[PDB]
Write a protein that binds this ligand. Structure first.
Ligand SMILES: C[C@@H]1O[C@@H](O)[C@@H](O)[C@H](O)[C@@H]1O
Ligand SMILES: C[C@@H]1O[C@@H](O)[C@@H](O)[C@H](O)[C@@H]1O
Lengths: 297, 297
């Protein structure tokens, strides 16, 4: 069981922060504030951080129970965890596992329960996106049911998203203008100053794009790497795994990079935002210390 | 290189025919006809069958280019494959990789382009679901764009589904009842007479549930097993892998089953629809011939 990464090209993998195929691979050295994503977080030893779900397909999924019958297009849900246990809002988690970890003007959804007139679409407005409190108020809900006390399961499908930069802004999970009562995974910061976070990007469907249509949400690890770490017994024999990104078809080595053991990748010598080809495969080379300096891209 | 399966519980894995977590594990010996699913199909040696996408997150996604500007809530797309190449209708494929492989009244979707005024919702009516012909007519499309010539990407999110048995009926991909020119993965049939297909089930969101409200779509392999077969170079050393399904928490061996090398699981001795616990893990035991007789559940 020596360390390895799966043999998948970047374009054959999926985002761990929005369910969709990876579409871009890039480093942007001019980002002013480090991201503090709560999904897509996993150590190389397979320990999940933040709200990262153990089951890949619980990302952007939710379940709960109606607290009241639908009225005036409002559906209020008391939230459960994926495993159907009750989400305890006095415990300090920001949200059930897999809930969105960024700021949006609304989160559009679909949901359904065990009876027929409970399939509907709706949305959570930003001011209602307070899942740390243990429930969510869904508005613009367009089904006639459920009545009270009914299990509902659903999916967040798209967002109203005026600024692309808000994908890196944590939401006000407890509605309290941000508290240090929540258990949040720490910011993602390269351990050497010339290093830049390598971002795995995908395109979510969003509205509110009228004047700026490009939307890109980034993550630290492909979902398939998170599952790889969960299904292997890896021991980090070093601070960081030195990787090479290779076009396996043409043989061309594109760059070397460091996969830090807390679960993110960096490159060295990036002076402007730089995109990389998507048809490459990251291959493990060897274990290196944190102070190891990479060949510049 | 020795055959294995990932150490995930069934409820920690995902459907390969509808993007959602697995919710049921069951065998039904009284299903009228054998399924001929085109997604979720992969041999143990990692050969994808049917329309099964290589990238997990391509399932239920589509990409194409608008044929004309939106008018009267109609958007017609000429279809592409996931890799952005043009889908070739002469090739014999029934649809681009990842397209739905079952009959429904409507396929509800959301889509968006790189430019403003292109985020919308819509649906493909059954009579318009003829992707083998190389395009799809989306109706009830609610955005003002796109114009002609614009690349659109989207996701099928729910279906109108009056009859649950239609999940096991292939759609009329080319607009007719005649599928002889189409390269279809074969029907899934156990090789020994008392065997029953073991179905991995999830709940899709559907409308039209007034007759029968329970909706369950089944698949032959969890998506994480398909990716496992792609990322390992297994050789099939016998006709079937004998597996044991074990509750790893308690230790109770629940049943043994056969994973045939063409990519599906059977159990023996099921005489009525039988559901099984979701908290177990499948473990490889040994390679066995087609006629190896399992201990009955
Ligand atoms: C109810 C509103 O409807 C449209 O304006 C969408 O663009 C917004 O995201 C919001 O959902
Ligand atoms: C146009 C129709 O609208 C509603 O009746 C849905 O329940 C149907 O599935 C279809 O989408």
């Amino acid at each position: 069981e020596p360390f390895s990464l799966p043999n998948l090209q970047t374009d054959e993998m999926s985002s761990s922060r929005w369910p969709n195929p990876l579409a871009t691979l890039f480093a942007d050295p001019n980002v002013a504030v480090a991201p503090q994503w709560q999904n897509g977080r996993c150590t190389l030893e397979g320990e999940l951080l933040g709200t990262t779900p153990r089951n890949a397909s619980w990302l952007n999924r939710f379940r709960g129970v109606s607290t009241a019958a639908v009225a005036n297009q409002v559906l209020h849900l008391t939230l459960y965890e994926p495993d159907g246990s009750v989400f305890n809002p006095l415990s300090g988690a920001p949200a059930p596992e897999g809930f969105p970890d960024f700021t949006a003007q609304e989160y559009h959804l679909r949901a359904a329960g065990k009876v027929a007139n409970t399939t509907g679409g709706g949305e959570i407005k930003s001011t209602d996106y307070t899942p740390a409190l243990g429930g969510v108020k869904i508005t613009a809900w367009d089904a006639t049911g459920p009545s009270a006390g009914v299990e509902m399961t659903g999916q967040i499908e798209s967002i109203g998203m005026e600024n692309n930069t808000d994908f890196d802004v944590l939401p006000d999970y407890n509605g309290s203008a941000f508290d240090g009562s929540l258990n949040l995974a720490p910011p993602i910061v390269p351990l050497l100053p010339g290093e830049t976070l390598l971002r795995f990007g995908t395109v979510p469907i969003t509205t509110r794009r009228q004047s700026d249509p490009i939307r890109i949400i980034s993550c630290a690890l492909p979902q398939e790497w998170i599952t790889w770490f969960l299904t292997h017994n890896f021991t980090a024999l070093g601070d960081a795994a030195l990787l090479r990104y290779r076009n396996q078809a043409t043989g061309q080595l594109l760059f070397e990079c460091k996969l830090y053991r807390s679960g993110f990748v960096v490159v060295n010598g990036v002076n402007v935002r730089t995109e990389f080809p998507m048809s490459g495969v990251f291959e493990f080379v060897s274990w290196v210390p944190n102070f190891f300096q990479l060949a510049p891209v």
